[PDB]
């Protein structure tokens, strides 16, 4: 459980407009913004907002167990700080197109060496990995909007005893 007041402050800081200033005829393309199931406002550039919220959560500014969900099909953007949500951790793949590291894990051998040592080269544990943006938590509701590789070998594109992996040929490319 986490308080929702900083979330509302961040949303209002980044261009969210309240309900009293909302006209459904004018806003035929805006995204409804929900916080803990409460419709609090609207926004017209949801991509920048979700990128900013996710970057803030990955940096430790927002608590790691806060849910950030973007429903593109329904034009909704939901945030949950409720208590009782079951989550699990996952590695983060660098999805920025403008970056050179696109399609590769953010965690490197430097992180593994720091974890083995136990301290940073100017305590380094699991929380240090979580607040460095190489690992993050996702719950069941946020899992519906992400694309997960099963193994790190899956990130890069005739024996009778070895098991056979899915081809996944329906898509020309996978991000």
């Amino acid at each position: 459980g986490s308080p929702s007041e900083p979330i509302i402050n961040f949303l209002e800081e980044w261009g969210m407009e309240p309900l009293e200033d909302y006209d459904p005829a004018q806003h035929t393309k805006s995204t409804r913004i929900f916080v803990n199931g409460v419709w609090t406002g609207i926004h017209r550039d949801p991509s920048m907002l979700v990128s900013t919220m996710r970057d803030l959560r990955r940096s430790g500014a927002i608590s790691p167990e806060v849910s950030i969900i973007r429903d593109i099909r329904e034009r909704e953007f939901k945030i949950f700080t409720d208590v009782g949500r079951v989550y699990r951790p996952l590695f983060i793949v660098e999805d920025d197109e403008s970056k050179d590291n696109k399609g590769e894990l953010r965690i490197t051998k430097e992180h593994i060496r720091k974890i083995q040592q136990g301290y940073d080269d100017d305590v380094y544990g699991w929380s240090s990995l979580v607040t460095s943006g190489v690992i993050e938590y996702v719950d069941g509701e946020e899992e519906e909007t992400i694309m997960i590789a099963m193994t790190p070998e899956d990130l890069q594109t005739n024996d009778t005893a070895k098991r056979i992996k899915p081809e996944m040929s329906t898509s020309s490319h996978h991000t």
């Binding site: 459980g1 965690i107 593994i112 974890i115 544990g125 699991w126 929380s127 990995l129 790190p152």
Partner: protein, 161 residues
């Protein structure tokens, strides 16, 4: 950089289990409860009010009491002879006691009148073992052995009777 092997993934998982353990959810929930939830529940309805428009010279008297801070202590055991001493879970297991701690609440009384207070013991709350309010949280490996507690025991439970 260099690629990430399966052994690196197991190193990361070892870091996870070194930080969290296997019963972290129970202890974290109980610590949240004891730290904030009791105070918030007390402050939900912080004011009892009694009024009496006495006419027996009309004097409208309001009597009201406020609830203040919550004070907690480490669990204690009170014997029949009247003495008290710190309790540990092994003694509670052996003597069929309850591992619980007293809760104190500040009550402030005011006497409002218009013509026209210290710590009170409110009960004992059972303590979850190896939590922030348990006696075994601090004890190191040697005193844990001296207290007849198993170092492999993880906590996350209560001792009632």
């Amino acid at each position: 950089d260099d690629t990430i092997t399966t052994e690196d993934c197991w190193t990361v998982i070892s870091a996870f289990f070194e930080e969290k353990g296997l019963v972290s959810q129970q202890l974290d929930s109980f610590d949240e409860f004891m730290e904030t939830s009791i105070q918030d529940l007390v402050w939900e309805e912080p004011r009892l009010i009694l009024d009496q428009p006495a006419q027996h010279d009309n004097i409208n008297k309001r009597y009201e009491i406020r609830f203040g801070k919550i004070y907690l202590s480490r669990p204690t055991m009170t014997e029949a002879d009247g003495t008290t001493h710190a309790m540990f879970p092994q003694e509670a297991r052996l003597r069929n006691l309850t591992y619980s701690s007293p809760v104190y609440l500040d009550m402030e009384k005011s006497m409002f009148t218009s013509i026209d207070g210290n710590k009170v013991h409110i009960g004992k709350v059972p303590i979850m073992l190896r939590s922030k309010f348990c006696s075994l949280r601090t004890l190191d490996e040697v005193d844990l052995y001296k207290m007849k507690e198993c170092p492999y025991d993880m906590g996350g439970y209560f001792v009632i009777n």
